[PDB]
């Protein structure tokens, strides 16, 4: 089976997970979700890297996913980060998300253990055969130590009907170009979304479908506009939007994400600037950089 | 406990599987092969032991069986780190309860902590456990590199941290990790995390290796270190050069895929792994056949 | 008007019996002019500038200029890692009647960013010929920072543009953006065939090409579709050309392209040491790709 | 055999003053090298700014070097370009001037194939009597000589005496030493990075062609000499003590920092030729501190 509502185009926000006094801060979370919804965002990715999946426990995951679904109420698909480096454990998280009523799962290539390409394929196949959710492959070699080859992504697209697309966070334009080209040749409706905000414009140019975004946490309307202008055939306006957002795109990565984005959302009054070890709050220099860029972007 | 402060070879031992379960009889044979050949420590449930796919119940069985066989002859150090500081503490406590002599704690992978984050991660754990802790740096797998200055800060401040397994292959890092850590604390241990860097890490002033190659060639890796420690640098270098083909072959695919194929060729285990890992290709198996034969191991 | 838009072909320097093959060469120039190429770059990397002596240089540049008869710009590779020698080469180009010079960042000696600025400044002030900065860190060991490129753009009016062969999309993006903010009319051409489409999307002006040696009409088309406002057709030309773009770099350029031009009957497959002719594997690949491509 | 030195070969700078060779300062430097026990001199290497020294100056610099040295140690002349034809010419010029050997860089910028590199050195080998030193420096050239390629060279071209290995990867260092000496037992492998010298010696190599020895000849000599004497701990201690200076000399592209340093020491004018320019104030201040710390100032 499969859930086609996961086949979104445009911006899917990899939303942070707000904490306060060491627990989930769902009141702040709800404000953030509504901020996304009110600003034209087309999907919500919960418990991705940006949402600190490594440090959110099982009971917290269920609470956060359920609350998200309640707020969203079917307006846009809700896609849940649910991948580890164990194929068995990954299936368990996928099934928990399915049980909760999620539309889809975002499933990272196993990190740290560096599986072969055939291993990656078998990993997704095992999951694909045991769920009715739409599955999004998540490639981010900088974090995981492994890169899904475009040919491997294409084989997945052809064989695993459950897998609806891929979040491509390898910043190499050769990879972006070939991932878009090969997967869509294998299956014409396979989606390819940028996993890098600053690659979005070029991934659209390559023939892709949008972005699963960090920037949209703080600037959803602008990221939406970037994509919307492109799809409208207004390449020049899309590029101008991309240009305008550049300072913010870079500033959100001067330290490991989500450290800067949480500092920025705290500056804007949405959340407490609290993360879980081994992550720690942004440096004073990062915070000063964000303050200036946000003010210059009219967000503060 | 100075027991964990081993010099020489600590074998990062594989976890044998058969028909989807732990193969503890094969594991016992491997452990005895290690003991018979003079290795100075065992590291259980490291990367080579497929820690990501071995469940909690299996971890208990595997660690208990190891201690039963080893019977206090050499330290048993248990891999017990995740990318969550809270969960890592839990794993370390379980390891303590099991009777581990120490823990090997990988830098959090995938979430790319800052240097202050790495420090705080080890400080949090170090202050809350009675066991010796070995920092494990392996940027190629984790996405993060512990700077030599950060390792030195850890050595100076965290008395519980007994040393570092340094698997960053850059000789500049190797040189500086050894130098800065031992300046911070004279008996801070530094072991190579790469078999083919062992010789140079020894030259840099380090203490040995936590090894993949010793799963199949324990005696030769022990000889490499022993020749060095006894003042015979050129003989150590010769041992190194003779092992180089085997050292290279064991990483032509992601470890432990080749080492399990090798141990299977040698009759020790079934060639079985857990997804997302899969058995070695025919090309890899053929290479191992040749290299193991040349080495006098087949 | 060295400010060309579209395709500027980095043409190979044909040899035969260890001497310049000026006969084969002229055919190739015509092959170029017939298919709407917008410029010619002579004695670039692809033209084996390192192994072509000064007399050959002169004979080659003059023969080129006579054939082109002013139809399109002739831009001559004239750069070494010595600022003083580079000037000598640039003045020579200027005297033979070149329209512009392609000046590679000093290779091998890894100058500082200030060093690169003073390098182009010194040359720029002692010539009245259009200058193209040429950045290709993979070969030279140095990368012109976009901010350095933009400082060149703003300060040195003689510097007309940059050939950007750093394949990193981040660099491509920033080079285009900063230099054009510094100076609206500053030109940025791709130095990698397989980056052309993206460089165009980035606001660039075309490509100084290797592939165009063998498929000039297609490269021109790739650009023309883009300039006309047909982004999708352009991307398709780009995808269709992908096999050939890759095949031409399976060994160090121009080893593959010369082999290809030989398959197509244009030149003899001869290079000068330390370059040697393509392997059999390379040749077989090229034969297949060229056929699939309709060029053989 | 005279060319087959062990220990320190100084890649000596080329001094300039008011735009011309400063042979008077150069002679002072050469004497500083000899006095401090250096085992060879490499002239017109990267450190000697070979790209910007004209043909006439090359001759004047080489001739003066041989006159001062008068056969005490091998004088090896940097004589390689990215053109095989031109390289042969420079090699012949060096040979006619009386150089004891030539240091021949892998062709830079045109990225030759492994076979091309082999044919490049074969072509030169068969056409001169001088000992040739292969110079591998991928960071500057864009090409890396494979250890297997260097071993083929060792086996085949009896005229090639050794290699200056400036690829800083310890794997490459290890395998270049290992494979070349297996091909030919007396093939020399010298480090082309000061901060790799200790490890290259441990690998079984033969010393270093050095930048640091320009300012600290005796210290670099001691590093190698302690190792060769079987004094591993002492060699390691020299290595550790030289770390600050080794790093400071490359905070900007060599020879920018080493010229600033020699100028601080009063040996030369701080003048380079474009596209090189003098060291920044930050670099100058670091060198001052590091040199005083090292007892060189």
UniProtKB/Swiss-Prot annotation, chain C:
Where does this protein act, in terms of pathway? Amino-acid biosynthesis; L-lysine biosynthesis via DAP pathway; (S)-tetrahydrodipicolinate from L-aspartate: step 3/4
Give the UniProt subcellular location, in the record's own words: Cytoplasm
Q: Known activity regulation?
A: Is not inhibited by (S)-lysine, in contrast to E.coli DapA.
Q: Which InterPro entries match?
A: Aldolase_TIM, DapA, DapA-like, Schiff_base-form_aldolases_AS, Schiff_base-form_aldolases_CS
Q: What is its main location?
A: cytoplasm
Provide the residue positions that the database annotates as binding pyruvate.
Answer: 46, 208
Q: Which reaction does it catalyse?
A: L-aspartate 4-semialdehyde + pyruvate = (2S,4S)-4-hydroxy-2,3,4,5-tetrahydrodipicolinate + H2O + H(+)
Query: One Pfam family from the UniProt entry?
Result: DHDPS
- GO cellular component: a single term: cytosol
User: How does activity fare over a range of temperatures?
Assistant: Highly thermostable. Retains over 60% of the activity after 7 hours incubation at 90 degrees Celsius.
Q: Where is this site: Part of a proton relay during catalysis?
A: 45, 108
Q: Which GO terms describe its biological process?
A: diaminopimelate biosynthetic process; lysine biosynthetic process via diaminopimelate
Look up the EC number in the record and give it: 4.3.3.7
Instruction: Give the molecular function GO annotations.
Output: 4-hydroxy-tetrahydrodipicolinate synthase activity
Q: Which residues form the active site?
A: 134, 163
What UniProt keywords are attached to this protein's entry? Answer: Amino-acid biosynthesis, Cytoplasm, Diaminopimelate biosynthesis, Lyase, Lysine biosynthesis, Schiff base
Functional summary from the UniProt entry: Catalyzes the condensation of (S)-aspartate-beta-semialdehyde [(S)-ASA] and pyruvate to 4-hydroxy-tetrahydrodipicolinate (HTPA).
Q: Subunit details for this protein?
A: Homotetramer; dimer of dimers.
Family indicated by similarity: Belongs to the DapA family.
PANTHER family reported for this sequence: 4-HYDROXY-2-OXOGLUTARATE ALDOLASE, MITOCHONDRIAL, DIHYDRODIPICOLINATE SYNTHASE
Task: Return the protein name.
Answer: 4-hydroxy-tetrahydrodipicolinate synthase
The record lists the lineage as: Bacteria, Thermotogati, Thermotogota, Thermotogae, Thermotogales
As recorded in Swiss-Prot or TrEMBL, the protein's gene is named: dapA
């Amino acid at each position: 089976g499969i859930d086609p509502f996961t086949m979104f185009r445009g911006v899917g926000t990899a939303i942070v997970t707000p904490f306060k006094n060491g627990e989930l801060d769902l009141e702040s979370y709800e404000r953030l979700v509504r901020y996304q919804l009110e600003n034209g965002v087309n999907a919500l990715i919960v418990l991705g890297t940006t949402g600190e999946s490594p440090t959110v426990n099982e009971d917290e995951r269920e609470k956060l996913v359920s609350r998200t679904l309640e707020i969203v109420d079917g307006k846009i698909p809700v896609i849940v980060g649910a991948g580890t480096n164990s194929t068995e454990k990954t299936l368990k998280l996928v099934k928990q998300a399915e049980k909760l009523g999620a539309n889809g799962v975002l499933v990272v290539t196993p990190y740290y253990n560096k599986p072969t390409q055939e291993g990656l394929y078998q990993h997704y196949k095992y999951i694909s055969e045991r769920t009715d959710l739409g599955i999004v492959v998540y490639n981010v070699p900088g974090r995981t130590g492994v890169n899904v080859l475009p040919e491997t992504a294409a084989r997945i697209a052809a064989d695993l009907k459950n897998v609806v697309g891929i979040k491509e966070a390898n910043p190499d334009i050769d990879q972006i170009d070939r991932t878009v080209s090969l997967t869509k040749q294998a299956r014409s409706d396979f989606m390819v979304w940028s996993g890098n905000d600053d690659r979005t414009f070029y991934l659209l140019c390559a023939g892709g479908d949008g972005v699963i975004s960090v920037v949209s946490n703080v600037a959803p309307k602008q990221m939406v506009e970037l994509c919307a202008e492109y799809f409208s055939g207004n390449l020049e306006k899309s590029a101008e939007v991309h240009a305008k957002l550049r300072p913010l795109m870079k500033a959100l990565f001067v330290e490991t994400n989500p450290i800067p984005v949480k500092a920025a959302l705290n500056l804007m009054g949405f959340i407490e600037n609290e993360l879980r070890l081994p992550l720690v709050p942004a440096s004073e220099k990062t915070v000063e950089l964000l303050r200036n860029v946000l003010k210059e972007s009219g967000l503060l």
